[PDB]
Amino acid sequence: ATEIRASVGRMVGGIGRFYIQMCTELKLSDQEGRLIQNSITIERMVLSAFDERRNRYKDPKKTGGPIYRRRDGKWVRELILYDKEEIRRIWRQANNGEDATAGLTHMMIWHSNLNDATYQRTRALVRTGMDPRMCSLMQGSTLPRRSGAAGAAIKGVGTMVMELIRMIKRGINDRNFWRGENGRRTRIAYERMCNILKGKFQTAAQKAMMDQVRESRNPGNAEIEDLIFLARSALILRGSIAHKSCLPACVYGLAVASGYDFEREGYSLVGIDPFRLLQNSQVFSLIRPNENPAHKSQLVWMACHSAAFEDLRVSSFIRGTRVIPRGQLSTRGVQIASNENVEAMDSSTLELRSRYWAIRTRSGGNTNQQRASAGQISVQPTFSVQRNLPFERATIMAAFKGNTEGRTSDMRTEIIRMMESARPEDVSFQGRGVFELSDEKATNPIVPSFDMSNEGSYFFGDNAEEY
Amino acid sequence: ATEIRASVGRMVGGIGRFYIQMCTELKLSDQEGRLIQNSITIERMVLSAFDERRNRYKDPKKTGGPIYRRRDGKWVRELILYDKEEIRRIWRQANNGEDATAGLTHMMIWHSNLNDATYQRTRALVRTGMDPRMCSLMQGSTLPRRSGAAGAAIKGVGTMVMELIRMIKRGINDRNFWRGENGRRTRIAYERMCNILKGKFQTAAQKAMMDQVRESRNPGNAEIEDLIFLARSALILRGSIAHKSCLPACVYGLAVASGYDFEREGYSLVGIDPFRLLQNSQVFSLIRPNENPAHKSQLVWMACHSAAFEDLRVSSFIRGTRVIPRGQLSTRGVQIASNENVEAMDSSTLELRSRYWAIRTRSGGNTNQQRASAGQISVQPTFSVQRNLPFERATIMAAFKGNTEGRTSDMRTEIIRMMESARPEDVSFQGRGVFELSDEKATNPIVPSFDMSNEGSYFFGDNAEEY
Amino acid sequence: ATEIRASVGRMVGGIGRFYIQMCTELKLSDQEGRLIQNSITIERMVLSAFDERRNRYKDPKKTGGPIYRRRDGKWVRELILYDKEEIRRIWRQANNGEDATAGLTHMMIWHSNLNDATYQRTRALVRTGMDPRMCSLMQGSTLPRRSGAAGAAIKGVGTMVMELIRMIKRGINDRNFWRGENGRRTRIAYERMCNILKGKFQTAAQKAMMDQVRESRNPGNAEIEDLIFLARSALILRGSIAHKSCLPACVYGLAVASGYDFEREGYSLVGIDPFRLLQNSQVFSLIRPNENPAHKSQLVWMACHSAAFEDLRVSSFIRGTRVIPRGQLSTRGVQIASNENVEAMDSSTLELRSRYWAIRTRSGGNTNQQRASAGQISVQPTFSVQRNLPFERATIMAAFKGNTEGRTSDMRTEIIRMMESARPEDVSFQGRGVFELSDEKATNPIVPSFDMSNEGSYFFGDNAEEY
């Protein structure tokens, strides 16, 4: 109900209180509690304080991280160390005798999102033997293993497939590990992942084709090839994947400080609240000597809206400033590896405001054509009479396309068919528009007309017009 | 010789006498002996009276069926029961101390034919995992198992392939049944069917490709996929399948009553006699309240000439009235399931005459191109001299089409090549025309010009212009 | 250094002395020492005198062959017999206490070359199940087994692949012969051949694809299919294969007689010396009654420059007369089978001069495109806003081409991609030209302009304009 919304704010308020409470535990300056990198330090400290082999990506039961401080002049890094069980202690009292890890996960989503915005992860994509071409499909691949079910929501088709192929490989040529106890422990790990990916697919032929891949005990090369095929297909006939807007702990923090009652107001990760919130919020970042603060700003705003693989046009359109392609950006990662000191770096306010707001979908657009097409298509002569013998020249020759020696042959062909139908400008979401921020409900949807300025669409593509 | 023709009439006369003799055994009215549904009742009673596990599709050694009677008013159904050995008794005395089952089979052909005209058997085609697209190829699929060798003549390519795939399946994932005794009993069942289908194929590359499919003990997915490929191919490069004209027992019956001496005159199922015969013959049918007698007429005439998958143009052209597409017909099946009573139904004369007659082929048209094309096609530079390096851009790229990881790769490619060559209006049977019914021999062939009226070709296709 | 050149002449001079020394051992007329067929008799006598199961393609430790003699009138054949160890004896004394088989091999190269010029070896290409289409790739297939490493240099891609498939076959369905001792003796025979062929390939994707073929103990149908695919690909994206100019022993012979000091002057099989040499040399051949001496001349000149698969244009261009297609030639083989007597045949001077000379490459032209193309190519909607969803329609659909159920799928696709890029007139060797024979070094390269006369390119192709 609005149950769903009051329990979402429950857990966001969770973060807020926590962060705030934490912020004095380090006596961090007011101004320093807003600094993004100090926030990430903290977030990944709570997660570092709750895992063992999952969640968060010379050591006891402690956990530290670089913490920055502007002191009588420049910035400096004071990496610290805290007791997990001491941090564990807070979270709970800030969440009322519970931990309701839903909070924990929310954060570790934001991190991924942020990452999907930052790191063009081609190098890993080849090792799997799939195509670097496929960034758009790799959502939340930086997601830790065993990551929350509602975290598997985020993962894109490409993210998932990879992971599976990764097991098939450990299976095909490495010690046959569906052979007994583990044979079932890590066969179900597999069986379920296929359905989850099966779950995300739009067309039925794709789903129909995921089954064949799952019904193969001791699966191998044919199966891994099938999965890449399936992965490619997802570029057009696209997968329905979630997109949640998740902010740095500090935003939620200052929000709570300024007096927001999140359990009163409720929250949704797909609605207005995240935009509203970003509008009224200041968050600083450090910037490397030769970097562009504006571009840092873009990077984070993108991250904040899981926007990494969105048509740059719409992104720029909602944003109110041109959102720029990845290789043209004048920035590296938000986080600062301990090499570069911090004598060089200055800090800066990040520009995270938007002109419009829009609703985050869990969809993939449209993808279909015909129910089962049952027509006869050709002729069988009965009589000895001179005449041509008709046949559907085109639909017949298309039937032989993508044919294969395996049981996915005509399922592949079907995709190829359905794929060929499509065109780069079949409209989707027809009707649904953006919103003025005053418009709190959905008064006026604004559909945008896109013989516009940018004209270029992909964040991780290649040049043609610059900046 | 005309031996072949005098022994064909021997067995048709067979039917005629029988039917007649049978007709008084039920004292069926004169008018009632002509009714088609009463004829089918009888036909399938003789077959019901001769099988055990083949031929014909609360019970002793008997056999009955719905028999209809117009009584002092409307029609009514008087389903009966007879002793097989009593029916068995007649057939033989009507065939002179023999049964010469050639008769038996002839009938069970007509039934199939009739069925190929009536039932769009898509639902079954999917279960096999082949394409509903493929009606034209499904001739005599309604044919019972173990059906006569000269009944396997009728079967189309699609009918056959299905049947095989059906065994391969019972083989791949169901108890390995080529493993010993049955291992050979039902491996030869298989080995022979491939050759029979191999037999029907036109091109050599197809035949060449059937072999590879047969030479595989314990055959599976690759083989079943190969067979569908082969099945598709048969839509264009088409299979040579028989087409025999086979009438209801009653036609042959009244013919004999009216004094035809079939052994004197002889018969052929591919010549004039069937048309001649249909011309001079009346056969009534019952018709459901909201049905079109004309359309019933068409359905049966089609059935009577194995015309179900013929270009509607030629069919309409021979017929003398427009033969209409299947979904546009205002009728259901000829047979009446016992649900609908017969108080509603009236009967009607069926219009089975034709304007012209034509010769029934066992061919599939033309299909070929080149003997083995041996040319060099590219260049290997010997010298360091600046210049382009020639090559057959098109014939090379075509070579990579339909390539496969299996031993049918370039055999597939070859088909794909030969298939692509073809065009929906390569003329076939060049020269052979239709005939005026007076023209008893082959005086004047009439080749038809087909920028005509209908313009639409397939009986089981989809709309564009209606009725 | 010029070490490389002084040791090449060492071994050519080898041949020369030998031949000469041999020529008096038969007291062969001066005029008869120049006759080509008598030279081949001798060459294959030395090789016949040095092998057991390799090198050279009712008998003791002897070796003879048809030797021809013009006697007081016509020509006649005096087939002889010599002791291997007697011939063995000479070669060595003519090569100074060594045999330096490098000579032996040089000859057995010329023979192959000659053969590649003469015999359109389609009949064998089918038996392997590869395409007759593929002459251009079959260099030195007539090469004996175990033929010298620097003889494997000559072999083209097609020659090689065949040989492998030939083992795979003896492997797939014939007694599993990688199973133990031989299991490794003739598995390494295999492993090495893949690398040698791998070695010859231009693109990396091809090489990358040869590996997968090699990493398969007990390899079969999938592998043999992979190799043909690879073979086809070599028609466009062509293989780097050596081309050495190797003359009949007699040329080298008369050269030495006339006083050339080959160890003084040095030799190269890729430079000017072979042309220079051919210019100043007379060599006679016998000609069958209905044959064209000019065409015999062409055949041998082609053979002499490993030119059999060269663009006829360049060949004619260097040659100075039109080099004619194979089926249009008015000659059969150089060698005379003992059936046809020699009463009919006359002899003739062969026209082996050239207008220009050019440098023999070991290259295959150009073949490439892009380093790893890493771009994003499509979009994943984040927001519910009405708009089309962009994607690279063409580069995506091309990705599904040549897909396969095997681990070479996208390696195949990659080739298909790279192959499609190409065009029959991408120039290669850009800059490198021919040479006037006076021009001893590389003063003036002559790049030829080829809107010329012939316009037809392949030696073993099919008609369009004749002679």
Side-chain angles (χ1 to χ4, degrees), chain A residues 1-55 59-61 63-467, chain B residues 1-55 59-61 63-467, chain C residues 1-55 59-61 63-467:
Chain A
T2 309
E3 171 218 65
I4 232 90
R5 185 178 211 282
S7 45
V8 153
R10 199 225 171 198
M11 79 92 169
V12 127
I15 324 281
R17 270 157 281 154
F18 180 79
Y19 186 73
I20 285 198
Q21 208 41 59
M22 202 81 175
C23 273
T24 46
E25 288 288 273
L26 314 132
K27 269 147 194 165
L28 285 173
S29 169
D30 156 36
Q31 194 223 357
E32 294 167 359
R34 308 167 193 277
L35 181 67
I36 181 88
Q37 13 265 170
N38 270 324
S39 192
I40 291 158
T41 263
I42 307 178
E43 306 145 18
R44 78 197 334 279
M45 267 193 51
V46 207
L47 314 178
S48 218
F50 263 88
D51 88 277
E52 324 77 44
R53 302 217 286 186
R54 69 270 190 110
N55 240 346
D59 131 51
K61 47 288 166 287
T63 173
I67 270 195
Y68 311 90
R69 298 191 137 104
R70 207 196 68 79
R71 312 194 73 155
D72 219 325
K74 59 299 288 286
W75 284 95
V76 276
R77 173 165 41 204
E78 276 209 52
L79 66 93
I80 51 88
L81 297 168
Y82 252 99
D83 266 18
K84 292 199 177 88
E85 45 275 63
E86 171 56 18
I87 307 329
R88 232 197 312 286
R89 209 224 90 210
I90 333 266
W91 181 241
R92 303 166 173 213
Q93 290 271 210
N95 286 285
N96 311 50
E98 293 161 309
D99 84 306
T101 64
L104 292 166
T105 54
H106 176 89
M107 250 147 307
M108 156 216 119
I109 295 186
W110 131 256
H111 286 130
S112 159
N113 276 350
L114 167 49
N115 234 249
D116 304 340
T118 317
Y119 295 110
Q120 156 85 143
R121 276 169 295 262
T122 55
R123 174 186 265 184
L125 277 150
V126 295
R127 268 181 302 253
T128 323
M130 63 199 311
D131 204 338
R133 263 42 238 262
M134 302 188 181
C135 337
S136 44
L137 311 153
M138 296 319 281
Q139 206 184 125
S141 35
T142 21
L143 243 26
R145 91 135 311 181
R146 170 65 45 220
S147 33
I154 275 69
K155 301 163 153 199
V157 165
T159 273
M160 291 263 80
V161 175
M162 194 203 70
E163 305 184 358
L164 294 106
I165 291 165
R166 172 59 96 164
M167 286 164 60
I168 315 269
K169 282 219 209 292
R170 275 297 135 268
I172 296 170
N173 260 171
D174 206 0
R175 217 68 315 182
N176 40 227
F177 74 97
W178 7 76
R179 305 207 86 278
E181 36 162 339
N182 325 313
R184 304 304 180 176
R185 289 169 184 171
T186 15
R187 156 80 202 205
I188 44 152
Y190 177 95
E191 282 238 39
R192 293 208 288 80
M193 290 164 71
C194 306
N195 284 37
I196 317 316
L197 208 172
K198 186 187 179 190
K200 293 181 181 171
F201 273 142
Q202 306 283 31
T203 57
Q206 269 165 347
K207 325 195 68 134
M209 154 141 71
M210 266 303 272
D211 297 315
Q212 265 98 101
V213 172
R214 166 181 40 78
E215 50 96 19
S216 194
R217 229 157 305 261
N218 213 58
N221 282 121
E223 281 69 35
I224 88 115
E225 290 312 320
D226 280 0
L227 286 167
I228 294 186
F229 177 104
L230 232 35
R232 278 183 231 295
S233 78
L235 288 162
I236 322 305
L237 309 186
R238 259 165 286 248
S240 298
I241 48 197
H243 304 254
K244 333 281 234 302
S245 285
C246 311
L247 330 187
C250 74
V251 188
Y252 295 127
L254 177 77
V256 170
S258 309
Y260 203 52
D261 179 338
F262 277 103
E263 194 212 71
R264 258 292 92 114
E265 322 300 346
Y267 211 76
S268 92
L269 324 315
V270 287
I272 175 154
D273 333 51
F275 282 90
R276 248 209 265 86
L277 189 27
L278 256 321
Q279 287 296 100
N280 299 311
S281 208
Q282 76 175 168
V283 168
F284 314 119
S285 177
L286 287 168
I287 113 279
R288 300 171 177 78
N290 268 327
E291 273 189 327
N292 196 306
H295 295 148
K296 193 77 78 183
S297 298
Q298 174 194 314
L299 181 52
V300 168
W301 174 98
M302 291 195 92
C304 296
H305 293 98
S306 297
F309 309 114
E310 238 303 355
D311 193 343
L312 295 164
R313 326 194 280 162
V314 343
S315 289
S316 306
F317 185 68
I318 270 113
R319 219 284 167 100
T321 75
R322 196 141 100 223
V323 186
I324 291 163
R326 184 54 176 113
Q328 309 197 340
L329 249 17
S330 220
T331 182
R332 268 211 277 103
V334 161
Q335 334 217 357
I336 302 81
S338 58
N339 296 249
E340 44 209 333
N341 68 352
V342 186
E343 147 73 344
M345 300 167 178
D346 306 9
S347 85
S348 186
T349 308
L350 292 183
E351 190 43 72
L352 308 189
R353 303 198 288 271
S354 321
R355 169 82 188 73
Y356 298 116
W357 75 273
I359 297 181
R360 263 85 65 235
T361 58
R362 171 250 321 197
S363 170
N366 278 253
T367 41
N368 36 251
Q369 173 42 10
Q370 293 143 187
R371 307 276 81 125
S373 342
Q376 176 184 137
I377 272 161
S378 164
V379 124
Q380 205 83 219
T382 303
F383 313 100
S384 212
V385 177
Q386 190 223 119
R387 35 76 181 253
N388 72 115
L389 299 182
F391 69 83
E392 299 310 287
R393 196 215 187 301
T395 81
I396 299 298
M397 294 310 275
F400 283 104
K401 206 181 198 76
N403 286 198
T404 222
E405 290 284 12
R407 84 252 84 253
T408 62
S409 179
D410 55 45
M411 273 302 105
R412 298 171 157 258
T413 286
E414 181 52 40
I415 304 331
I416 308 265
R417 211 215 69 234
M418 287 186 93
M419 276 187 47
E420 162 62 46
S421 303
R423 293 302 192 287
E425 70 290 340
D426 321 307
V427 277
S428 321
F429 305 105
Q430 162 104 238
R432 282 147 273 166
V434 297
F435 298 109
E436 285 269 22
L437 283 146
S438 67
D439 180 356
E440 279 270 346
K441 287 150 294 184
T443 328
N444 302 288
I446 325 292
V447 194
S449 211
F450 270 145
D451 26 283
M452 231 291 146
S453 218
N454 201 342
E455 283 295 341
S457 290
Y458 320 115
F459 188 54
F460 297 95
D462 319 282
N463 305 348
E465 62 284 345
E466 259 257 348
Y467 290 117
Chain B
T2 309
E3 171 218 65
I4 232 90
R5 185 178 211 282
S7 45
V8 153
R10 199 225 171 198
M11 79 92 169
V12 127
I15 324 281
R17 270 157 281 154
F18 180 79
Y19 186 73
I20 285 198
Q21 208 41 59
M22 202 81 175
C23 273
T24 46
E25 288 288 273
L26 314 132
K27 269 147 194 165
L28 285 173
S29 169
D30 156 36
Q31 194 223 357
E32 294 167 359
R34 308 167 193 277
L35 181 67
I36 181 88
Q37 13 265 170
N38 270 324
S39 192
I40 291 158
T41 263
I42 307 178
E43 306 145 18
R44 78 197 334 279
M45 267 193 51
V46 207
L47 314 178
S48 218
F50 263 88
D51 88 277
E52 324 77 44
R53 302 217 286 186
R54 69 270 190 110
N55 240 346
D59 131 51
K61 47 288 166 287
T63 173
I67 270 195
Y68 311 90
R69 298 191 137 104
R70 207 196 68 79
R71 312 194 73 155
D72 219 325
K74 59 299 288 286
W75 284 95
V76 276
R77 173 165 41 204
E78 276 209 52
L79 66 93
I80 51 88
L81 297 168
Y82 252 99
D83 266 18
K84 292 199 177 88
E85 45 275 63
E86 171 56 18
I87 307 329
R88 232 197 312 286
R89 209 224 90 210
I90 333 266
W91 181 241
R92 303 166 173 213
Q93 290 271 210
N95 286 285
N96 311 50
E98 293 161 309
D99 84 306
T101 64
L104 292 166
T105 54
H106 176 89
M107 250 147 307
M108 156 216 119
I109 295 186
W110 131 256
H111 286 130
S112 159
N113 276 350
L114 167 49
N115 234 249
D116 304 340
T118 317
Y119 295 110
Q120 156 85 143
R121 276 169 295 262
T122 55
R123 174 186 265 184
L125 277 150
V126 295
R127 268 181 302 253
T128 323
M130 63 199 311
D131 204 338
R133 263 42 238 262
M134 302 188 181
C135 337
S136 44
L137 311 153
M138 296 319 281
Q139 206 184 125
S141 35
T142 21
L143 243 26
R145 91 135 311 181
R146 170 65 45 220
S147 33
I154 275 69
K155 301 163 153 199
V157 165
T159 273
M160 291 263 80
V161 175
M162 194 203 70
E163 305 184 358
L164 294 106
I165 291 165
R166 172 59 96 164
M167 286 164 60
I168 315 269
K169 282 219 209 292
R170 275 297 135 268
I172 296 170
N173 260 171
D174 206 0
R175 217 68 315 182
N176 40 227
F177 74 97
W178 7 76
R179 305 207 86 278
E181 36 162 339
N182 325 313
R184 304 304 180 176
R185 289 169 184 171
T186 15
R187 156 80 202 205
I188 44 152
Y190 177 95
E191 282 238 39
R192 293 208 288 80
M193 290 164 71
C194 306
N195 284 37
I196 317 316
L197 208 172
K198 186 187 179 190
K200 293 181 181 171
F201 273 142
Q202 306 283 31
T203 57
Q206 269 165 347
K207 325 195 68 134
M209 154 141 71
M210 266 303 272
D211 297 315
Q212 265 98 101
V213 172
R214 166 181 40 78
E215 50 96 19
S216 194
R217 229 157 305 261
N218 213 58
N221 282 121
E223 281 69 35
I224 88 115
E225 290 312 320
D226 280 0
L227 286 167
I228 294 186
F229 177 104
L230 232 35
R232 278 183 231 295
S233 78
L235 288 162
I236 322 305
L237 309 186
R238 259 165 286 248
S240 298
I241 48 197
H243 304 254
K244 333 281 234 302
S245 285
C246 311
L247 330 187
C250 74
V251 188
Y252 295 127
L254 177 77
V256 170
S258 309
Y260 203 52
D261 179 338
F262 277 103
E263 194 212 71
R264 258 292 92 114
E265 322 300 346
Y267 211 76
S268 92
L269 324 315
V270 287
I272 175 154
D273 333 51
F275 282 90
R276 248 209 265 86
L277 189 27
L278 256 321
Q279 287 296 100
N280 299 311
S281 208
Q282 76 175 168
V283 168
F284 314 119
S285 177
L286 287 168
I287 113 279
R288 300 171 177 78
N290 268 327
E291 273 189 327
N292 196 306
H295 295 148
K296 193 77 78 183
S297 298
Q298 174 194 314
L299 181 52
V300 168
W301 174 98
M302 291 195 92
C304 296
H305 293 98
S306 297
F309 309 114
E310 238 303 355
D311 193 343
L312 295 164
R313 326 194 280 162
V314 343
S315 289
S316 306
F317 185 68
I318 270 113
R319 219 284 167 100
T321 75
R322 196 141 100 223
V323 186
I324 291 163
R326 184 54 176 113
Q328 309 197 340
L329 249 17
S330 220
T331 182
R332 268 211 277 103
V334 161
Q335 334 217 357
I336 302 81
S338 58
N339 296 249
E340 44 209 333
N341 68 352
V342 186
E343 147 73 344
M345 300 167 178
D346 306 9
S347 85
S348 186
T349 308
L350 292 183
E351 190 43 72
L352 308 189
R353 303 198 288 271
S354 321
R355 169 82 188 73
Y356 298 116
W357 75 273
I359 297 181
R360 263 85 65 235
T361 58
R362 171 250 321 197
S363 170
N366 278 253
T367 41
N368 36 251
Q369 173 42 10
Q370 293 143 187
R371 307 276 81 125
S373 342
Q376 176 184 137
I377 272 161
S378 164
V379 124
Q380 205 83 219
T382 303
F383 313 100
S384 212
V385 177
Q386 190 223 119
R387 35 76 181 253
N388 72 115
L389 299 182
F391 69 83
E392 299 310 287
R393 196 215 187 301
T395 81
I396 299 298
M397 294 310 275
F400 283 104
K401 206 181 198 76
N403 286 198
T404 222
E405 290 284 12
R407 84 252 84 253
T408 62
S409 179
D410 55 45
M411 273 302 105
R412 298 171 157 258
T413 286
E414 181 52 40
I415 304 331
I416 308 265
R417 211 215 69 234
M418 287 186 93
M419 276 187 47
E420 162 62 46
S421 303
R423 293 302 192 287
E425 70 290 340
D426 321 307
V427 277
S428 321
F429 305 105
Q430 162 104 238
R432 282 147 273 166
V434 297
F435 298 109
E436 285 269 22
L437 283 146
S438 67
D439 180 356
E440 279 270 346
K441 287 150 294 184
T443 328
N444 302 288
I446 325 292
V447 194
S449 211
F450 270 145
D451 26 283
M452 231 291 146
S453 218
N454 201 342
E455 283 295 341
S457 290
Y458 320 115
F459 188 54
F460 297 95
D462 319 282
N463 305 348
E465 62 284 345
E466 259 257 348
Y467 290 117
Chain C
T2 309
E3 171 218 65
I4 232 90
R5 185 178 211 282
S7 45
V8 153
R10 199 225 171 198
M11 79 92 169
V12 127
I15 324 281
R17 270 157 281 154
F18 180 79
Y19 186 73
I20 285 198
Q21 208 41 59
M22 202 81 175
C23 273
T24 46
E25 288 288 273
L26 314 132
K27 269 147 194 165
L28 285 173
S29 169
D30 156 36
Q31 194 223 357
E32 294 167 359
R34 308 167 193 277
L35 181 67
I36 181 88
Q37 13 265 170
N38 270 324
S39 192
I40 291 158
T41 263
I42 307 178
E43 306 145 18
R44 78 197 334 279
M45 267 193 51
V46 207
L47 314 178
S48 218
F50 263 88
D51 88 277
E52 324 77 44
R53 302 217 286 186
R54 69 270 190 110
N55 240 346
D59 131 51
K61 47 288 166 287
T63 173
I67 270 195
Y68 311 90
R69 298 191 137 104
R70 207 196 68 79
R71 312 194 73 155
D72 219 325
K74 59 299 288 286
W75 284 95
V76 276
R77 173 165 41 204
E78 276 209 52
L79 66 93
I80 51 88
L81 297 168
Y82 252 99
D83 266 18
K84 292 199 177 88
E85 45 275 63
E86 171 56 18
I87 307 329
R88 232 197 312 286
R89 209 224 90 210
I90 333 266
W91 181 241
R92 303 166 173 213
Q93 290 271 210
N95 286 285
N96 311 50
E98 293 161 309
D99 84 306
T101 64
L104 292 166
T105 54
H106 176 89
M107 250 147 307
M108 156 216 119
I109 295 186
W110 131 256
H111 286 130
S112 159
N113 276 350
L114 167 49
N115 234 249
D116 304 340
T118 317
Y119 295 110
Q120 156 85 143
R121 276 169 295 262
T122 55
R123 174 186 265 184
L125 277 150
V126 295
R127 268 181 302 253
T128 323
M130 63 199 311
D131 204 338
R133 263 42 238 262
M134 302 188 181
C135 337
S136 44
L137 311 153
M138 296 319 281
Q139 206 184 125
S141 35
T142 21
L143 243 26
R145 91 135 311 181
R146 170 65 45 220
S147 33
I154 275 69
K155 301 163 153 199
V157 165
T159 273
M160 291 263 80
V161 175
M162 194 203 70
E163 305 184 358
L164 294 106
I165 291 165
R166 172 59 96 164
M167 286 164 60
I168 315 269
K169 282 219 209 292
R170 275 297 135 268
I172 296 170
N173 260 171
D174 206 0
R175 217 68 315 182
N176 40 227
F177 74 97
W178 7 76
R179 305 207 86 278
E181 36 162 339
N182 325 313
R184 304 304 180 176
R185 289 169 184 171
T186 15
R187 156 80 202 205
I188 44 152
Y190 177 95
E191 282 238 39
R192 293 208 288 80
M193 290 164 71
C194 306
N195 284 37
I196 317 316
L197 208 172
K198 186 187 179 190
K200 293 181 181 171
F201 273 142
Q202 306 283 31
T203 57
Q206 269 165 347
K207 325 195 68 134
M209 154 141 71
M210 266 303 272
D211 297 315
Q212 265 98 101
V213 172
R214 166 181 40 78
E215 50 96 19
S216 194
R217 229 157 305 261
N218 213 58
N221 282 121
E223 281 69 35
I224 88 115
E225 290 312 320
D226 280 0
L227 286 167
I228 294 186
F229 177 104
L230 232 35
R232 278 183 231 295
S233 78
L235 288 162
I236 322 305
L237 309 186
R238 259 165 286 248
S240 298
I241 48 197
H243 304 254
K244 333 281 234 302
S245 285
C246 311
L247 330 187
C250 74
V251 188
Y252 295 127
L254 177 77
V256 170
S258 309
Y260 203 52
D261 179 338
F262 277 103
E263 194 212 71
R264 258 292 92 114
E265 322 300 346
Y267 211 76
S268 92
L269 324 315
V270 287
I272 175 154
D273 333 51
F275 282 90
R276 248 209 265 86
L277 189 27
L278 256 321
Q279 287 296 100
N280 299 311
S281 208
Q282 76 175 168
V283 168
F284 314 119
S285 177
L286 287 168
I287 113 279
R288 300 171 177 78
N290 268 327
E291 273 189 327
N292 196 306
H295 295 148
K296 193 77 78 183
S297 298
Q298 174 194 314
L299 181 52
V300 168
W301 174 98
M302 291 195 92
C304 296
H305 293 98
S306 297
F309 309 114
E310 238 303 355
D311 193 343
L312 295 164
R313 326 194 280 162
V314 343
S315 289
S316 306
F317 185 68
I318 270 113
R319 219 284 167 100
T321 75
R322 196 141 100 223
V323 186
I324 291 163
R326 184 54 176 113
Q328 309 197 340
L329 249 17
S330 220
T331 182
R332 268 211 277 103
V334 161
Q335 334 217 357
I336 302 81
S338 58
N339 296 249
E340 44 209 333
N341 68 352
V342 186
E343 147 73 344
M345 300 167 178
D346 306 9
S347 85
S348 186
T349 308
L350 292 183
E351 190 43 72
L352 308 189
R353 303 198 288 271
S354 321
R355 169 82 188 73
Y356 298 116
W357 75 273
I359 297 181
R360 263 85 65 235
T361 58
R362 171 250 321 197
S363 170
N366 278 253
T367 41
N368 36 251
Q369 173 42 10
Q370 293 143 187
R371 307 276 81 125
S373 342
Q376 176 184 137
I377 272 161
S378 164
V379 124
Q380 205 83 219
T382 303
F383 313 100
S384 212
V385 177
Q386 190 223 119
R387 35 76 181 253
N388 72 115
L389 299 182
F391 69 83
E392 299 310 287
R393 196 215 187 301
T395 81
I396 299 298
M397 294 310 275
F400 283 104
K401 206 181 198 76
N403 286 198
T404 222
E405 290 284 12
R407 84 252 84 253
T408 62
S409 179
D410 55 45
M411 273 302 105
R412 298 171 157 258
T413 286
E414 181 52 40
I415 304 331
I416 308 265
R417 211 215 69 234
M418 287 186 93
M419 276 187 47
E420 162 62 46
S421 303
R423 293 302 192 287
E425 70 290 340
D426 321 307
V427 277
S428 321
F429 305 105
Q430 162 104 238
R432 282 147 273 166
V434 297
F435 298 109
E436 285 269 22
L437 283 146
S438 67
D439 180 356
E440 279 270 346
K441 287 150 294 184
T443 328
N444 302 288
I446 325 292
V447 194
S449 211
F450 270 145
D451 26 283
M452 231 291 146
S453 218
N454 201 342
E455 283 295 341
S457 290
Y458 320 115
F459 188 54
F460 297 95
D462 319 282
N463 305 348
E465 62 284 345
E466 259 257 348
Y467 290 117

